[PDB]
Nucleic acid binder design. Structure first.
Ligand SMILES: [Ca+2]
Ligand SMILES: [Ca+2]
Length: 1203
RNA sequence: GGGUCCAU
RNA sequence: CGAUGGACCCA
């Protein structure tokens, strides 16, 4: 308390400089009211210039247009909140007119007449505002598009109206074209990227003209892309700008486009390890019924809401208790989640998307500077987003003398609150220091508490999610005999007690009914507790009167609505969303609870375009009702993909596209493309010839041709693709060929598993003198396994892993394969497995019923090569339902060892290392799962596993040959665990060969049969695999080639050399579009055709029906039509700002389903779920509907991006 | 429920 | 009258 207080406000509310920066500029001016101003003048630039240490990342970009002089300014600050201020507008708006009138295309000239004022702000504000770049465009007719204030473009043209340069300014604002004409490139960038990326596949072998032609035709792209001309138009992506710009009386002279903060690095702004790094430096001197209240700190980027957020974590572990970068701390009764609102629109992305909103805000200002000019933007990020209540912590008060000064700061930050209809007068304000709290000063520590216990009394208890009215997202309807109508869904809020009246409201005239009951897969509880996955039973209502989407709420709770007001964010390009902006006519589907729904929208007053990244407010009207109320999140999806999220603000009042086009493809599709000869065999022969390689002369050669393993990769890439392309072909005419070769083989497996099941139960050679590498690895192996696995299979596991999928069983068949048919029909069951089946029967009230009980499985024939079929077993159903328990847990466990069976990727990623480092090897085994004898399986597994494993397996089988066998192998492929087992047996077996050879076990990675282990192991792993039964396939195990292959990918020294096969005789136009696409993928290098093969492609393209030669698709979208450029595609009907292309699809007729089976499969699955960008939590899994494939094809219109 | 690739 | 798992594509 030094000089005066009252007439210091006068010093503040004159310049607007920090408070103490005022009482102390009077603490050096004897009390001179007008001197005070000057001393702060020439003392503010020491501020602003030791301010340059704060990066200027955010800001605004300005544009002005006079007759035909335009200028695009790009002054910027360092915060959303400044860049939208009242004051930051004044400056960078007036500086924009100093470039207009006086045309100042020079940047230094204006960063000079203003540097006086460029501190009359920073002093008042507190962010490094550096006026960045200026420059202007002289045009004869030019226009500008202004996108928020974030991205600005300037396009001067000629002969074009406003309705042109607007658009072509909007194209420039949504397609960052760094050039104006395809022929604008300097032979630097062009002989950079053309004599750099010439060796690229010139080293790949590909000879001169090829790499020459590819590279070149690639730069034809590397240019058209970045250039206004060959750049698909943005408001009509069919024609490029250069073909729109020509169709009119116009031509772009040039364009300038600035984006608020490009080039500027801006290094990440974490929080936890930011706060924790503050908290763990001043650390140096039963009850889950606790609510979770989300709070965020919001304030000025330097009043240390980072410190004040540390004081609430320290002082709160020093006393009481103890998404995406939020810091939790605990309180005697509640549980908090603290954010830091660091950017206005950077936050609305969060509350909207649903990430983490705020149940209560906390405004950190420092009493040293008072409220800030951009404080209001903070408080206006308040009103504008919902945050219920706002708490105000006044930081750094010791640094203030006179107390009447403080009661003047409040004075202000109460009167800003109440310009934003927040309760200003009745809002709480704590005065205290953050840094001192850390230090340890308890006269201050009680303030960080005085605040904490304000969060304990001003932000009220959030309404328990199980306490609000009833509501439950109906996701599937069933008509069971004796239950009538039942819906199943995860009850979202409230309780439904059996007997109560629920009202089914949503899509049609809302209906009434009454709760007959509620059941899970096991219990039958008389109520539904929100958060549970139950089915709820209804009386007196037909099942064609409900649909997915509707909810089942207590009556009056929620009403159907069609039009409303919202705020939605649009998934940026890199977040897997759209990548072309859209405009006035967006027409998507809106995913609500369990169903899409189409709907049109209207942008607000003045916005005309919208783009990836934007988060626009918009009014939406749907094609028909949903049950909706304020605070209901919804995704925005376009055929499959999620491209935007968003919530509902207020719920309003409310009450080309050709066909005999689609018609023409339907028919062409069903054409049987016809030609003489083995088509395929021609495509192959012609393809070989295209690469100076001699074709097959008989189809007899097609698969008796062995590659050469030495040659330039190109000389080999082509060659492997020769030895493999026609290797799986079925329609192979001549050839004394059969599936009975397949059995013969299958029939050896046994003889082998005898030979080895027998002498593997005889670990007594003769003596004790000598020792065997085999007998040893089993001993290591066995132990290792037991530590990974256990005594026996867990039941908290055997439970969370036993499911019912796949097609056929000894009692079902492809026709009735889908799970609900397994729950409907009485499934088989092996004798030994009977005890489990009942265990289940005792676990549920549903009729787990076992049909015929037997020890047999059916051994059959799925096709494999051109010279042999595969030998399978259709298990008895109920065995399978359990075989999947231990197949499943064997998975989860095989994870510790490093093996991930859910990802053929880690295992083919390495296949590639191998081929380059020549250290890893890849090993193939022959009849993989067929040689695992019980012997080797017994002395290797725990005896509790080895039973639960004997129990569930099929011990006998019946062949088509009429006869039987008594499996010598522990398990046939077909078996439910046979995979995760061979994985584990193989893996362990190799890991042991690792230890005995002193090699880092962890270098062994296995996938069923595909083992990859350190190359030294391969002779031992081979001598072992010998001894223990398996037979190690020389011709397809590599430990030295330039070549490895693993999990479908092959490789020749870093280069991919994975071929493709033309498995069956090609007759359908679908069947062609495949080979043709597979071809395309195998010789494209990111769009550019290797020419050699582009030859044989085009030639065969011509075999296809006219319309279909021209109907093309982006890659990664199937084979319902030739992969090509989707813009060219003519039957590409654009609709509602979302492209739609037509793809062929195998035709289907709806079929009857079993209402129990599915109802049981749905509840049972819901039980399964319970013992097992960031907004895909608005996406469930869909109902059960069945259909048999017909012989026909059908044209399906699907959604689409621009690449 | 239908695909393509893929390990058995 | 086509087993079991991946991984993605439609639905
Ligand atoms: Ca293999
Ligand atoms: Ca094999």
């Amino acid at each position: 308390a030094e000089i005066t207080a009252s007439l210091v406000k006068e010093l503040r509310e004159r310049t607007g400089a920090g408070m103490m920066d005022c009482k102390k500029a009077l603490t050096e001016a004897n009390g001179d009211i007008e001197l005070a101003i000057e001393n702060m003048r020439k003392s503010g630039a020491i501020k602003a210039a030791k301010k340059a240490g704060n990066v200027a990342a955010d800001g605004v970009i300005k544009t002005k247009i006079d007759g035909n002089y335009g200028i695009i300014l790009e002054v910027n600050c360092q915060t959303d909140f400044v860049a939208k201020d009242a004051g930051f507008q004044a400056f960078a708006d007036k500086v924009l007119d100093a470039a207009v009138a006086g045309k100042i295309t020079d940047v230094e000239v204006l960063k000079a007449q203003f540097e006086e004022e460029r501190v009359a702000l920073v002093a008042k504000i507190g962010e490094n505002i550096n006026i960045r770049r200026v420059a202007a465009l002289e045009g004869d007719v030019l226009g500008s598009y202004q996108h928020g204030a974030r991205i600005g473009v300037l396009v001067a043209a000629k002969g074009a109206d406003e309705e042109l340069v607007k658009h072509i300014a909007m194209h420039v604002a949504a397609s960052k074209p760094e050039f104006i004409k395809p022929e604008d490139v300097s032979a630097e960038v062009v002989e950079k990227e053309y004599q750099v990326q010439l060796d690229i596949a010139m080293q790949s072998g590909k000879p001169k003209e090829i790499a020459e032609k590819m590279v070149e035709g690639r730069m034809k792209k590397f240019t058209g892309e970045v250039s206004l001309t060959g750049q698909p138009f943005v408001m009509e992506p069919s024609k490029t700008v250069g073909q729109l710009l020509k169709e009119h009386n116009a031509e772009v002279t040039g364009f300038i486009r600035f984006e608020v903060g490009e080039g500027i690095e801006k290094v990440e702004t974490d929080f936890a390890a930011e706060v924790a790094a503050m908290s763990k430096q001043s650390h140096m001197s039963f009850e889950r019924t606790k609510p979770h209240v989300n709070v965020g700190t919001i304030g000025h980027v330097d009043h240390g809401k980072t410190t004040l957020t540390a004081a609430i974590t320290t002082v709160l572990a020093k006393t009481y208790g103890g998404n995406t970068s939020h810091v939790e701390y605990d309180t005697p009764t509640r549980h908090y989640a603290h954010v830091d609102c660091p950017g206005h629109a950077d936050y609305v992305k969060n509350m909207i998307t649903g990430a983490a909103q705020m149940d209560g805000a906390i405004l950190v200002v420092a009493a040293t500077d008072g409220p800030m000019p951009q404080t209001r933007e903070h408080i206006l990020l308040g009103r504008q987003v919902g945050v219920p209540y706002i708490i105000v912590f006044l930081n750094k008060c010791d640094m203030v003398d006179d107390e009447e000064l403080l009661e003047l700061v409040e004075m202000e930050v109460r009167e800003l609150l109440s310009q934003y209809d927040f309760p200003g007068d009745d809002t709480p304000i704590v005065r205290g220091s953050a840094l001192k709290a850390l230090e340890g000063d308890a006269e201050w520590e009680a303030k960080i508490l005085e605040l904490a216990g304000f969060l304990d009394s001003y932000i009220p208890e959030p309404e328990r999610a199980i306490d609000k009215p009833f509501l439950l997202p109906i996701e599937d309807v069933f008509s069971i005999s004796g239950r009538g109508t039942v819906v199943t869904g995860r009850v979202e809020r409230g309780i439904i007690k059996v007997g109560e009246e629920v009202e089914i409201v949503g899509i049609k005239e809302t209906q009434k009914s009454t709760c007959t009951g509620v059941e899970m897969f096991r219990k039958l509880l008389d109520e539904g507790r929100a958060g549970e996955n139950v089915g709820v039973l209804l009386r007196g209502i037909k099942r064609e009167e409900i649909e997915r989407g509707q909810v089942l709420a207590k009556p009056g709770t929620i009403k159907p609505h069609t039009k409303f007001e919202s705020e939605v964010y649009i998934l940026s390009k890199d977040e897997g969303g759209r990548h072309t902006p859209f405009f006035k006519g967006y027409r998507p589907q809106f995913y609500f609870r369990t169903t899409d729904v189409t709907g049109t929208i209207e942008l607000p007053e003045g916005v005309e375009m919208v783009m990836p990244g934007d988060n626009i407010k918009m009014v939406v009207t749907l094609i028909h009702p949903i049950a909706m109320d304020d605070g209901l999140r919804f995704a925005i999806r376009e055929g499959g993909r999620t491209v935007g999220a968003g919530v509902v603000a207020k719920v309003l009042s409310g009450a080309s596209s050709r066909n005999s086009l689609s018609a023409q493809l339907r028919r062409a599709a069903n054409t049987r493309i016809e030609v003489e000869g083995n088509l395929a065999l021609s495509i192959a022969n012609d393809l070989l010839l295209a690469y100076g390689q001699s074709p097959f002369n008989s189809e007899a050669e097609c698969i008796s041709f062995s590659p050469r393993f030495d040659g330039t990769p190109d000389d080999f890439r082509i060659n492997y693709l020769k030895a493999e392309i026609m290797s799986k072909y079925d329609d192979f005419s001549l050839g004394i060929d059969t599936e009975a070769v397949a059995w013969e083989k299958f029939l050896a497996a046994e003889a082998e598993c005898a030979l080895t099941n027998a002498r593997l139960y005889r670990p007594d050679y003769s003596e004790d003198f000598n020792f065997s590498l085999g007998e040893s690895c089993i001993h290591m192996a066995r132990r290792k396994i037991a530590k990974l696995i256990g005594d026996v299979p867990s039941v908290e596991g055997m439970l969370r892993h036993c499911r019912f999928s796949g097609g056929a069983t000894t009692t079902n068949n492809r026709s009735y394969g889908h799970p609900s048919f397994k729950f409907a029909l009485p499934q088989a069951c092996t004798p030994r497995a009977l005890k489990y089946v009942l265990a289940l029967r005792a676990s549920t009230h549903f009729d787990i019923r076992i049909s015929d009980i037997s020890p047999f499985n059916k051994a059959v024939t799925v096709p494999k090569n051109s010279k042999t079929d595969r030998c399978i077993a259709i298990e008895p159903g109920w065995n399978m339902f359990f075989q999947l328990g231990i197949g499943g847990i064997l998975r989860d466990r095989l994870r510790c060892w490093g093996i991930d069976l859910n990802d053929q990727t880690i295992n083919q990623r390495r296949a590639h290392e191998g081929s380059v480092t020549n250290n890893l090897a890849t090993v193939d085994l022959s009849a993989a799962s067929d040689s695992i004898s019980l012997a080797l399986c017994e002395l290797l597994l725990p005896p509790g596993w080895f039973e639960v494993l004997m129990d569930l397996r099929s011990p006998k089988g019946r062949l088509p040959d009429g006869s039987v066998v008594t499996y010598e192998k522990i398990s046939s492929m077909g078996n439910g665990y046979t995979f995760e087992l061979e994985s584990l047996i193989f893996a362990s077996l190799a890991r042991s060969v690792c230890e005995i050879l002193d090699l880092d076990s962890s270098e062994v990675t296995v996938y069923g049969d595909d083992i990859i282990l350190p190359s030294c192991a391969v002779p031992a792993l081979r001598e072992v695999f010998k001894y223990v039964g398996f037979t190690t396939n020389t011709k397809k195990t590599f430990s030295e080639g330039p070549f490895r292959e693993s999990c479908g990918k092959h490789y020749y020294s870093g280069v991919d050399v994975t071929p493709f096969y033309i498995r069956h005789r090609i007759v359908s136009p679908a069947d062609l579009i495949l080979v043709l696409n597979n071809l395309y993928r195998w010789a494209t290098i990111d769009g550019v055709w290797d020419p050699r093969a582009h030859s044989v492609y085009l030639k065969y393209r011509k075999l296809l029906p006219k319309q279909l030669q021209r109907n093309t698709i982006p890659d990664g979208y199937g084979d319902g039509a030739l992969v090509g450029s989707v813009l060219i595609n003519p039957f590409a009907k654009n609709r509602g700002w979302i492209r739609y292309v037509p793809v062929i699809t195998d035709h289907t007729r709806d079929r009857e389903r079993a209402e129990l089976g599915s109802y049981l499969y749905d509840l049972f699955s819901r039980c399964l779920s319970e013992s097992n960008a960031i907004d895909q939590l608005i996406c469930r899994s869909n109902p059960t509907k069945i259909s048999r494939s017909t012989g026909k094809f059908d044209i399906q219109y699907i959604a689409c991006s621009s690449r």
